[PDB]
Amino acid sequence: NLYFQGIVPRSFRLLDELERGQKGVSEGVSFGLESADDITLSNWSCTIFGQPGTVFENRIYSLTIFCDDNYPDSPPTVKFDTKIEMSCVDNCGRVIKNNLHILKNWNRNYTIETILISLRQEMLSSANKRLPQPNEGEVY
C-alpha cells in the first residue's frame, strides 16, 4: 500500500472521484461511469437537478463528461444530453469553455463534481434563470 503527499496519477485521481460518485455527493448532482467496464475511466454519466425558483425548477438534466488522457491537468469536455438553454451551452448542448469560469480558467484541483456544481450555479444567474426552455425531457 502506497503513500505520498501531493498529486496522484490520472488513474488514482479518477478512482478517487469514482468512489466519491458511487457513494451517492453534493446537492443535487450525481456522477459515475457511463459503463462499469471502461478501464480508462474516461466517460462519465452525470445528473443535474434544476435549481428551485428558476425556469429549470424540478427538471432533471442528463450529461456526459469525458476525461482525456491529460486529465486532471486539462479540462474534461462537457455536454448535455438533455436539452437546455444556458448562456454557456451551445446549440448542440456542449459547454462553451470560455463562458464558464472553471473550464476557461481550469485548475487541476477542480473535479467532475466542481463542474456539476458550477453548472447548477449558472442556473441561478440572471442571464439564465428566466430564459425560455425546451420541453422537459427533450434530448439532442
**Tell me, what CATH number does 107's domain have?**
3.10.110.10
Cβ contacts of 104 within 8 Å, gap of 6 or more = 97, 98
Resolution (A): 2.4
Q: How many domains does the chain have?
A: 1
Helices 112-122 + 10-22 axis angle, to 10:
60
> 35 phi and psi, to 5 degrees?
-140, 135
Q: Please give the span between the terminal C-alpha atoms of the chain, in angstroms, as a whole number.
A: 45
What are 134's three cell numbers? 425546451
Q: Which helix (H) or strand (E) holds 60?
A: strand 60-66
Domain that holds residue 86: 1-140
CB 79 within 8 A of CB 95: yes
